[PDB]
């Protein structure tokens, strides 16, 4: 299926997600150092089928349908600086996210 760009990345501590807005792209002016997150991306993978008990559980705890890898963009180590400009290109037929 299709990739997604989002802020809800599985298996990340809340610390690294202060510096992303709703759409999952860094602020303008935030200064980064090697190792942080720039864009939050998740890649769907295989959907194995299940039993009713975990359906009840995963509907109470309520988090997911398609347990999914993450492959976000990150600053290669040894680099630092101050983001100054973000650009977003979209096809003609994809719903435009808020920030574009």
């Amino acid at each position: 299926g299709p990739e997604e760009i989002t802020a809800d990345i599985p298996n990340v501590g809340e610390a690294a997600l202060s510096k992303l807005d709703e759409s999952g792209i860094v602020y303008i002016g935030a200064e980064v150092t090697g190792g942080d997150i720039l864009v939050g991306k998740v890649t769907p993978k295989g959907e194995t089928q299940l039993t009713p008990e975990e359906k009840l559980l995963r509907a109470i705890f309520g988090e997911k349908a398609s347990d999914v890898k993450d492959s976000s963009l990150r600053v290669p180590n040894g680099v630092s600086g101050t983001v100054i400009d973000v650009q977003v290109f979209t096809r003609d037929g994809v719903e435009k996210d808020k920030r574009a």
Partner: protein, 627 residues
């Protein structure tokens, strides 16, 4: 060395038995296990199998059930064939090709494993020895079963767990006050029973709005897994067996569900449970002349299962008499009317007066002493009484054993349990501060217009509007109007926060949008890492935020609660509490303060509450703190 027809054993899969070499190749060998009849194919290299042979003089069993006494064994073409004397008829010289042995071989004693050529690594022997040693040791502790539950060490809970968990078919009345942990006690009792093996099947009855809570609590505290029975699941399990209610071990169901069909109530009644757990028993109303519809079904259930636990409280501050209404379910013989019970309570009351006077350290009237002398049926009272009454050297132990004797004669000591805030120590102290701030003009400009619209509306609703001004300023000026740019409260909060960078602060506000906007202001104006916590979230995101707030020195500093549903984790290190704005009725205010007022605080809570002058807050702070 593999050759057709031999007998081999799988090294790891010993649960199959003997196997026979059916066919061979250069790299693959095929075995058949006749005992199950299963085909397996093993690669020649790495030899994951072992050869089996019986030494002369031992005994072998053929597939027809008659043993043998092996005397010699021959080898030809690589194939080994036994000769022996029978043992049923003792004929000699009978030979067996090994393909006529049993189908089930056993190696129940390890020396056969060693002699057949089975060698494991050294470490596994060490693990086996240490494992059995520790098991043997740890079974026996006197207080086993009370170390795996995720709760701090609170004595007035461990005492009840110890008392009721070491009974046989107990039946009690857990009627602890709110904020004391009745449900924690019920969980403790279930855990203690289930670990010793004393019971296996448990019913739990809770109304629809609460069911999910119980699930999560159990799964996250006492390591118990449940199944939920609704109309659906019971419907498709009606096919699955005669009684669907027999498939599982622990069952969650609501009383209203059982009342849907009487056949269903019989199905519940006929499944032979051990423990029954009943919730909000105070709701179950009974009259001697008016036995209610809900009462009868539970009365029917309580007759086929031994152990019952009742969860209840005594609301509207009415005396203990109302408990009688349900106590008949426990022991229907000893209870036979309410008038005698109330009479005995009236009789107890002067004795309670006397014991209160004695423990206060003040002298007892000699006329009252011949009521304690009546209440206990003995005649060695006076030597104890004179010593305990005049403050002798050992008057303390005298008084203690005397009141113990009276305890042994209490009407409901062993069948009913109560905890009150008054008599148990540990609670911290609540210290108050107050700050008043001047009112900016824009609020007056908005209120002068807003005072008109809410005409045909409740003074309750009119106050509920004006109480917190921001949500009306938004309505006149459009939503997301920049209200956070001239308030005194936001400025005060930032000033307080930025000079105390080593304090964890819990800020509670009115509703969700206000919480989010405060978080944004703080983050983009002063860089204070704050974590939001509101009632629209999932159950995982709440855990993520609460985990962040708990990091000691690198994580968040402010937790913004929005009218918390008091799901109530243990926040043991938070001590300051900032009340952004005030609500109407005091019960949920006690809820708010009790989000941090729990047993186990290192320091005493300190509450701050800044308010704008000449508005609802001005009236309410006065009314609460002084009235």
């Amino acid at each position: 060395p593999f050759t057709l027809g031999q007998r081999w054993i799988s090294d790891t899969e010993s649960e199959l038995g003997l196997g026979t070499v059916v066919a061979v190749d250069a790299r693959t060998v095929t075995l058949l296990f006749p005992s199950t009849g299963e085909n397996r194919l093993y690669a020649r290299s790495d030899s994951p199998v072992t050869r089996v042979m019986f030494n002369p003089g031992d005994t072998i069993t053929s597939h027809d059930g008659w043993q043998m006494q092996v005397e010699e064994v021959k080898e030809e073409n690589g194939l080994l064939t036994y000769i022996g004397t029978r043992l049923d008829t003792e004929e000699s010289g009978v030979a067996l090709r090994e393909v006529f042995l049993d189908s089930k071989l056993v190696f129940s004693k390890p020396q056969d494993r060693l002699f057949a050529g089975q060698i494991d690594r050294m470490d596994r022997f060490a693990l086996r020895y240490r494992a059995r040693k520790y098991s043997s040791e740890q079974f026996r502790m006197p207080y086993s079963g009370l170390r795996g539950q995720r709760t701090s060490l609170i004595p007035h809970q461990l005492n009840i767990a110890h008392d009721v968990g070491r009974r046989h078919a107990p039946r009690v009345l857990l009627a602890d006050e709110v904020g004391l942990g009745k449900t924690i006690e019920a969980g403790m009792i279930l855990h203690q029973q289930l670990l010793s093996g004393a019971a296996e099947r448990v019913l739990i009855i809770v109304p629809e709005t609460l069911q999910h809570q119980w699930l999560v609590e159990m799964l996250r505290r006492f390591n118990l897994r449940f199944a939920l029975f609704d109309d659906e699941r019971y419907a498709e399990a009606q096919h699955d067996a005669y009684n669907p209610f027999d498939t599982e071990q622990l069952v969650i169901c609501s009383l209203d569900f059982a009342r849907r069909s009487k056949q269903r109530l019989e199905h519940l009644c006929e499944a032979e449970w051990d423990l029954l757990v009943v919730d909000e028993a105070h709701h179950l109303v009974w009259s001697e002349d008016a036995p209610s519809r809900e009462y009868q079904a539970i009365e029917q259930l309580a007759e086929h299962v031994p152990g019952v636990l009742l969860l209840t409280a005594t609301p509207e501050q009415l005396g203990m008499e109302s408990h009688f209404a349900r106590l008949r379910l426990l022991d229907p013989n000893r209870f036979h009317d309410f008038a005698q019970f109330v009479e005995e309570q009236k009789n107890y009351r002067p004795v309670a007066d006397a014991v209160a006077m004695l423990l206060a350290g003040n002298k007892l009237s000699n006329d009252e002493l011949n009521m304690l002398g009546e209440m206990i049926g003995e005649q060695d009272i006076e030597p104890l009484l004179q010593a305990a009454n005049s403050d002798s050297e050992d008057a303390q132990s005298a008084r203690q054993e005397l009141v113990s004797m009276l305890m042994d004669r209490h009407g409901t000591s062993r069948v009913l349990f109560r905890n009150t805030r008054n008599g148990v120590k540990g609670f911290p102290k609540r210290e108050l501060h107050t700050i008043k701030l001047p009112l900016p003009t824009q609020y007056q400009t908005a209120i002068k217009v807003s005072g008109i619209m809410g005409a045909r509306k409740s003074a309750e609703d009119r106050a509920r509007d004006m109480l917190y001004p921001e949500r009306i300023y938004q309505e006149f000026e459009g939503d997301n109007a920049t209200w956070w740019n001239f308030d005194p409260r936001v400025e005060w909060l930032m000033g307080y926060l930025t000079s105390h960078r080593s304090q964890k602060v819990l800020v509670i506000c009115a509703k969700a949008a206000t919480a989010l906007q405060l978080e944004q202001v703080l983050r983009e104006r002063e860089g204070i890492r704050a974590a939001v916590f509101h009632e629209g979230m999932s159950i995982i995101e709440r855990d993520r935020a609460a985990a962040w707030f708990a990091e000691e020195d690198t994580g968040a500093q402010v937790l913004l609660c929005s009218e918390i549903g008091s799901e109530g984790r243990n926040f043991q290190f938070a001590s300051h509490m900032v009340m952004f704005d005030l609500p109407f009725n005091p019960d949920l205010l006690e809820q708010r303060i009790g989000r941090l007022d729990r047993i186990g605080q290192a320091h005493d809570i300190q509450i701050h509450v800044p308010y704008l002058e000449k508005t609802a807050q001005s009236v309410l702070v006065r009314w609460y703190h002084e009235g």
